[PDB]
């Protein structure tokens, strides 16, 4: 019966959420033609 939301959960999301956002953005850039 572990808790769902803890300090570790927030430490994981604060980094993981913008990281996947940025990875998708950088993926989009791979197709930008000059």
């Amino acid at each position: 019966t572990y808790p769902i939301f803890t300090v570790r959960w927030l430490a994981v999301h604060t980094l993981a959420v913008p990281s996947v956002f940025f990875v998708g953005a950088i993926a989009a850039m791979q197709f930008i033609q000059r």
Binding site: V23, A27, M29, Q30, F31, I32, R34
Partner: protein, 35 residues
């Protein structure tokens, strides 16, 4: 009802090599490819 951890590791590794290979593709296409 638990997905084996080795399957999760394989799926994540495939996706990570995929994003890395997409980033290396972009080195040769689009912006920053010198052509």
């Amino acid at each position: 009802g638990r997905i084996p951890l080795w399957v999760v590791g394989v799926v994540a590794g495939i996706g990570a090599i995929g994003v890395l290979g997409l980033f290396f593709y972009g080195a040769y296409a689009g912006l920053g490819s010198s052509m």
